[PDB]
């Protein structure tokens, strides 16, 4: 029991953690791409509202 | 600048302080009476003068201090005697000559004319420093080498470091320049009583306090930084435990905050503490006062000073902890502080909540207790200190229904539950094992396992034995000891032996004056082994009582075995007694 | 084994929490970069001279109206200080036009640092008791908080 | 959109007294407008305006009024009520009493600002609860059940393990499942807790792996006392956003409901208001109503909020104002006995006062058994009679317990021994426990039972 348990445990958790880290890095990359795409639009909208003034 | 305008008893209303801050101390009149600012209505302020307000004349100047209630810390804080408002009583008596406390004394808390041998650290003159750095160390005395550190909330590039020489407190030894400006720092420093000392990170308590008494050390362990409450009001047993803590406990230093108690009790304490002396592991004799800062506040003293004395003491303890030393703070009477609080609340006309106490009593009390724990210091080098509070509860009428008692019990982790009945039962420790509880038992897991793996099981079995004993007492009162089963009779006899020898420590005899953890644990192991191997043996009750009487005598000899005979020798004697009891019980059956 | 596999479960939980909090930290860093870019673009707009003058007059007029004070103390940056001195009582006339009233006294001089001030006007009131602070740098980071939900909506993927 | 205005900055503080800061010459104040006071030293703290009169505005700061000068502090009127930046990302993190992050993470990027103390649910729209909950404790699900939308607190005096019980419930919480994305998203408010207890909560929640679905709102006793009241508010605002406007079911947990009460009493006494019983404010019924009366199942949405607060009888007296008001509003109670704890029972639940007002709908044909109601009634009624038998035996003697009384005493003893007790992690399912519940009911004669009809239990079959 203990031998088979340690054999199964030694590596699977580390591989799962590495896969999760890789997936998180990929998601970070996608988010960075989206932010780069939307950066100037957001900046222009903010500038418009700051500059836009009445009364 | 600023003149009094309305002087109505304790409260004094003065105009002119447009810039006064809320809760800023201020000096009033020629006599320089001290008062706090409460209400800042318009351009005027409100001063509650602590001392007597008689004799004040209108337009008497009022001088602002630019500082909330603060205690001047640094070297030389130890040994001396201080009032609730941080006034050095001994130096006041020496300088003034007269006995009474003059109305308007202005003696500084620490005499800046005394010279201390200042030894700086190897820090570079052109280095960079931040708050909490142990930039030097001063030999304020023996046994309490004062590790002076750069003031918290101050970070800068050091410009000049003083050499190793005899300097006064007024003399400056440090200067730093983070921005363009360079600010010099002296050895003395100040901190408000209310705001706690900055701490990098509170830590989980891991190591226990060794009180030197077997009952508290074994049955109900208290961690470093663990809150403890004593229900002591008569018989001075609380003072006895405080003296034991001062003499033998693990605290690198101890601060006793006596507030609102009778003058005679304060005088008795002020004579008793100097008489006590603490033995080093080296064995040569050194007085406890050199490592003890005592703060006394009698009933004659102003109420506000009595209320603030607790925060004064806890701030001193916080300074010691930030200096990286384990420290214990003892409050003589929390109920006296509650009385001071109710008096102040009545003076300021707050809405009563429960039995006259102000509503905020729970919050203030909880904050004060919560200012104590194991702490990772600020700055470097990284060291850990601990403040543990053993504040004593003194319920009037001995009823737990008192709001202060209920709040403390809600907050306190360990309640040692001293009972006057045990004192009436000729028990010197007078620690009621039943009504007392320990909540830090799980915290001692690593320490107990490292010291003795079976110690946890022994403690659990001892608690079960105490419960079985309290049941068997009324069981015997019902019908008699004979009706009990043989194993139940053994259990009752072993519980009686435990209470008579292990639980009850005389502490008057030199052999039992200090009970180490090793000796207490070995005595508990011997008792539990004798009880166990007797319970499995049954054979008869009377028959084994006679044939194992030698085993009982050997177990009682563990109490005779003392550290005064030597710790390795005491351990060997306890092991031999346990082996003899084991052989006597096994061979007979 | 049962009481040990809790350690593996805790390790998995810690890894997941670290990953997600790192992702959220990246998102917040992107938001901070957006704020910095907005500030830089605001400074670039402040670099304008002629069209940049009209908004200053509008700010002065609107601040006078909302404050509704009889006397104010305006402070401007050294850059466009000539511009605001040229605006002068044109803002007061515009305020009297918005609501029929005698124009208040206008006083302009100390200036904050150019990039730090980023234009704007601090109209304030007498004795400095009441301050209507309208720096473009201060006007920004107020718009930012209001538009943050809109930005989070914009960030889809 | 209407042109924006930068918040006004004032310096006309014209009087300080207690926890209140007075202002004058304020141009267009707003009630409950959040103000962020900056002192002369440069530090900042917040507060609320409690009354608006003329150009005067009376503000109660949060961090305390110490260190405030009448001629150097500056007050800024944000011109809005207090708002918490609720967002879906808030899951799996911790926050201070005011909601500031303390999980060493970035501040929440809000999906939409929601004003706390939000409007009530149109009662035409509120709907009754109809779904049991697998909290992970036997005695709660077997008797005095909980419905997904029902509020019910835990009554427990000082020194009891109620905090550990709450931690166990939170870690073992789950739907009956008789999915995971919409599963229980637990919000754990912590009103006024000790630092050691806070560390215990943090460790237990982090290690359990529930951090994927649990948000903590920790507020220690060291925090400003006012920051304590806004906590179990912010918590309920986040719960409302997550359940109704986001969908996932929430099981809000409030600890030390008494500490909230104390926080109110202290604030009320500061405000010098009319006192109710024991010096507590007279409107505390309202201000608890605003906290308790939020959990429920709005119809138009598939979410659900379930409220499980924890009280603390101050003098171990249920007649104290806080438990009195709670028992008035909270739709039932679970009671914990100190005597049972003395008897070394880990879940020391005393079933005699432990009743669920909504249990009549929690039971049914969708879950539980047709004899659940009758068995619960019998095990709830015969326990009181057994206690009366024990009292009669104590006041007379052992021979006083007749052939019928002795059966009741034995039923009480076996009930306290077997049924109530449970493991520290026991997910004892309903049927296995109800088997021994009927065994306890059958300790008494199967015909002496008055209230229950024999046919109802006859529907169930032994073994």
From Swiss-Prot, chain B:
Cellular component annotations (GO), alphabetically ordered: plant-type vacuole; proton-transporting V-type ATPase, V1 domain
EC code: 7.1.2.2
Keyword Translocase: yes
EC top class named in words: translocase
Record keywords: ATP-binding, Hydrogen ion transport, Ion transport, Nucleotide-binding, Translocase, Transport
GO function terms (MF aspect): ATP binding; ATP hydrolysis activity; proton-transporting ATPase activity, rotational mechanism
InterPro entries per the UniProt record, alphabetical: ATP-synt_VA_C, ATP-synth_a_Xtn, ATP_synth_asu-like_sf, ATPase_a/bsu_AS, ATPase_F1/V1/A1_a/bsu_N, ATPase_F1/V1/A1_a/bsu_N_sf, ATPase_F1/V1/A1_a/bsu_nucl-bd, ATPase_F1/V1_b/a_C
Catalytic activities: ATP + H2O + 4 H(+)(in) = ADP + phosphate + 5 H(+)(out)
Residues the entry annotates as binding ATP: 232-239
Gene Ontology process terms (BP): ATP metabolic process
CDD domains on file: ATP-synt_V_A-type_alpha_C (cd18111), ATP-synt_V_A-type_alpha_N (cd18119), V_A-ATPase_A (cd01134)
Oligomer and partners: V-ATPase is a heteromultimeric enzyme composed of a peripheral catalytic V1 complex (main components: subunits A, B, C, D, E, and F) attached to an integral membrane V0 proton pore complex (main component: the proteolipid protein).
Role according to the record: Catalytic subunit of the peripheral V1 complex of vacuolar ATPase. V-ATPase vacuolar ATPase is responsible for acidifying a variety of intracellular compartments in eukaryotic cells.
Family, similarity comment: Belongs to the ATPase alpha/beta chains family.
Protein name: V-type proton ATPase catalytic subunit A
Protein source organism: Citrus unshiu (Satsuma mandarin)
Lineage of source species: Eukaryota, Viridiplantae, Streptophyta, Embryophyta, Tracheophyta
Curated annotation (Swiss-Prot), chain C:
Gene: VATE
GO MF annotations in UniProt: proton-transporting ATPase activity, rotational mechanism
The organism of origin for this protein: Citrus unshiu
Superkingdom, natural source: Eukaryota
Function of the molecule: Subunit of the peripheral V1 complex of vacuolar ATPase essential for assembly or catalytic function. V-ATPase is responsible for acidifying a variety of intracellular compartments in eukaryotic cells.
Keyword annotations from UniProtKB, A to Z: Hydrogen ion transport, Ion transport, Transport
Protein name, as recorded: V-type proton ATPase subunit E
Similarity section: Belongs to the V-ATPase E subunit family.
Subunit structure: V-ATPase is a heteromultimeric enzyme composed of a peripheral catalytic V1 complex (components A to H) attached to an integral membrane V0 proton pore complex (components: a, c, c', c'' and d).
Upper taxonomic lineage: Eukaryota, Viridiplantae, Streptophyta, Embryophyta, Tracheophyta
An annotated GO cellular component: proton-transporting two-sector ATPase complex, catalytic domain
């Amino acid at each position: 029991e203990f031998q088979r348990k340690l054999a199964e445990s030694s590596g699977d958790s580390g591989a799962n953690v590495k896969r999760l880290e890789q997936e998180t890095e990929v998601k970070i990359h996608h988010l960075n791409a989206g932010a780069e795409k939307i950066q100037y639009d957001v900046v222009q909208m903010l500038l418009k509202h700051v500059t836009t003034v009445k009364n | 600048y600023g003149y009094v305008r309305k002087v109505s008893g304790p409260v004094v209303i003065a105009d002119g302080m447009n810039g006064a801050a809320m809760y800023e101390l201020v000096r009033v009149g020629h006599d320089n009476l001290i008062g706090e600012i409460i209400r800042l209505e318009g351009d005027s302020a409100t001063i509650q003068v602590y001392e007597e307000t008689a004799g004040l004349m209108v337009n008497d100047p009022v001088l602002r201090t630019h500082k909330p209630l603060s205690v001047e810390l640094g070297p030389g804080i130890l040994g001396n005697i201080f009032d609730g408002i941080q006034r050095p009583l001994k130096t006041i008596a020496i300088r003034s000559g007269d006995v009474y406390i003059p109305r308007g004394v202005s003696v500084p808390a620490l005499d800046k004319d005394t010279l201390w041998e200042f030894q700086p650290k190897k820090i570079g003159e052109g280095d960079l420093l931040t708050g909490g750095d142990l930039y030097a160390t001063v030999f304020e005395n023996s046994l309490m080498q004062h590790h002076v550190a750069l003031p918290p909330d101050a970070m800068g590039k050091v410009t000049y470091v003083a050499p190793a020489g005899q300097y006064s407190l007024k003399d400056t030894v440090l200067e730093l320049e983070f921005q363009g400006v360079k600010k010099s720092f002296t050895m003395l420093q100040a901190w408000p009583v209310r705001t706690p000392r900055p701490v990098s990170s509170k830590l989980a308590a891991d190591t226990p306090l060794l009180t030197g008494q077997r009952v508290l050390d074994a049955l109900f362990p208290s961690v470093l930084g663990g809150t403890c409450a004593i229900p002591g009001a008569f018989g001075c047993g609380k003072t006895v435990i405080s003296q034991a803590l001062s003499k033998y406990s693990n605290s690198d230093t101890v601060v006793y905050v006596g507030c609102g108690e009778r003058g005679n009790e304060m005088a008795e304490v002020l004579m008793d503490f100097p008489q006590l002396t603490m033995t080093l592991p080296d064995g040569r004799e050194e007085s406890v006062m050199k490592r003890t800062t005592l703060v006394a506040n009698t009933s004659n003293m102003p109420v506000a000073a009595r209320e603030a004395s607790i925060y004064t003491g806890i701030t001193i303890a916080e300074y010691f902890r930030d200096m990286g030393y384990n420290v214990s703070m003892m409050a003589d009477s929390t109920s006296r502080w509650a009385e001071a609080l109710r008096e102040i609340s009545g003076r300021l006309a707050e809405m009563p909540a429960d039995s006259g106490y102000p509503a905020y009593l729970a919050a203030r009390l909880a904050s004060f207790y919560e200012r104590a724990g194991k702490v990772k210091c600020l700055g470097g080098p990284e060291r850990t200190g601990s403040v543990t509070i053993v504040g004593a509860v003194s319920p009037p009428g001995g009823d737990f229904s008192d709001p202060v008692t209920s709040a403390t019990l809600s907050i306190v982790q360990v309640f040692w539950g001293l009972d006057k009945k045990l004192a009436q039962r000729k028990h010197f420790p007078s620690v009621n094992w039943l009504i007392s509880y320990s909540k830090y038992s799980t915290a001692l897991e690593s320490f107990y396992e490292q010291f003795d793996p079976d110690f946890i099981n022994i403690r659990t079995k001892a608690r079960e034995v105490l419960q079985r004993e309290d049941d068997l007492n009324e069981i015997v009162q019902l019908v008699g000891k004979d009706a009990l089963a043989e194993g139940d009779k053994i259990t009752l006899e072993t519980a009686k032996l435990l209470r008579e020898d292990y639980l009850a420590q005389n502490a008057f005899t030199p052999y039992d004056k200090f009970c180490p953890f090793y000796k207490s644990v070995w005595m508990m192991r011997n008792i539990i082994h004798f009880y166990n191997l007797a319970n499995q043996a049954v054979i008869t009750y009377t028959l084994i009582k006679h044939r194992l009487g030698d085993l009982f005598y050997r177990l009682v000899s563990q109490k005779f075995e003392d550290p005064a005979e030597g710790e390795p020798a005491l351990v060997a004697k306890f092991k031999k007694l346990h082996e003899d009891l084991t052989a006597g019980f096994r061979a007979l059956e | 084994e049962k009481q040990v596999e809790i350690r593996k479960k805790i390790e998995y939980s810690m890894q997941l929490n670290a990953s997600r909090i790192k992702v959220l930290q990246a998102q917040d860093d992107l938001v901070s970069n957006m704020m910095e870019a907005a500030s830089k673009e605001v400074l670039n707009v402040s670099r304008d001279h002629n069209s940049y003058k009209k908004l200053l007059k509008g700010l002065i007029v609107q601040s006078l109206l909302r404050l509704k004070e009889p006397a104010v103390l305006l402070r401007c940056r050294k850059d466009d200080h000539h511009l605001v001195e040229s605006v002068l009582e044109s803002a007061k006339e515009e305020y009297a036009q918005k609501l029929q009233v005698h124009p208040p006294e206008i006083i302009v001089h100390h200036n904050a640092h150019g990039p730090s001030c980023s234009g704007g006007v601090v109209v304030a009131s007498r004795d400095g008791k009441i301050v209507c602070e309208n720096t473009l740098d201060a006007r920004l980071d107020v718009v930012f908080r209001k538009k943050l939900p809109e930005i989070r909506k914009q960030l889809v993927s | 959109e209407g042109t924006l205005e930068v918040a006004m900055e004032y310096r006309t503080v014209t009087g300080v007294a207690g926890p209140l800061v007075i202002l004058d010459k304020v141009k267009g104040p707003k009630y409950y407008e959040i103000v962020n006071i900056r002192l002369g030293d440069g530090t900042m703290r917040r507060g609320q305006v409690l009354e608006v009169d003329g150009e005067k505005a009376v503000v109660q700061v949060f961090e305390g009024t110490s260190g405030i000068d009448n001629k150097f502090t500056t007050v800024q009127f944000t011109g809005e009520v207090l708002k918490t930046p609720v967002s879906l990302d808030m899951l799996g993190r911790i926050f201070n009493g005011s909601g500031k992050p303390i999980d060493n993470g970035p501040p929440i990027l809000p999906e939409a600002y929601l004003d706390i103390s939000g409007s009530s649910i149109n009662p035409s729209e509120r709907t009754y609860p109809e779904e049991m909950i697998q909290t992970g404790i036997s005695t709660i699900d077997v008797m005095n059940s909980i419905a997904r939308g029902q509020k019910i607190p835990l009554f427990s005096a000082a020194g009891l393990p109620h905090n550990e019980i709450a931690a166990q419930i939170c870690r073992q919480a789950g739907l009956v499942k008789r999915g995971e994305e919409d599963n229980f998203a637990i919000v754990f408010a912590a009103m006024g807790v000790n630092m050691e207890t806070a560390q215990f909560f943090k460790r237990d929640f982090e290690e359990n792996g529930s951090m994927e679905r649990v948000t903590l709102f920790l507020n220690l006793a060291n925090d400003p006392t006012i920051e304590r009241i806004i906590t179990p508010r912010i918590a309920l605002t986040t719960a409302e956003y997550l359940a109704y406007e986001c969908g996932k079911h929430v099981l809000v947990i409030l600890t030390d409901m008494s500490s909230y009460a104390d926080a109110l009493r202290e604030v009320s006494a500061a405000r010098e208001e009319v006192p109710g019983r024991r010096g507590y404010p007279g409107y505390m019924y309202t201000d608890l109503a605003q906290i308790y009366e939020r959990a429920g199942r709005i119809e138009g949405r598939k979410g659900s909020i379930t409220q499980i607060p924890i009280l603390t009888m101050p003098n171990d007296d249920i007649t104290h104002p806080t438990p009195d008001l709670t028992g008035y509003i909270t739709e039932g109670q679970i009671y914990i006995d100190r005597q049972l704890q003395n008897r070394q029972i880990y879940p020391p639940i005393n079933v005699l006062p432990s009743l669920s007002r909504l249990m009549k709908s929690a039971i049914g044909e969708g879950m539980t058994r047709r004899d659940h109601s009758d068995v619960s009634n019998q095990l709830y009624a015969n326990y009181a009679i057994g206690k009366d038998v024990q009292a009669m035996k104590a006041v007379v003697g052992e021979e006083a317990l007749s052939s019928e009384d002795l059966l009741y005493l034995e039923f009480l003893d076996k009930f306290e021994r077997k049924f109530v007790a449970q493991g520290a992690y026991d997910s004892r399912n309903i049927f296995q426990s109800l088997d021994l519940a009927w065994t306890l009911l059958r300790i008494f004669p199967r015909e002496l039972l008055h209230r229950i009809p024999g046919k109802t239990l006859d529907q169930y079959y032994s073994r």
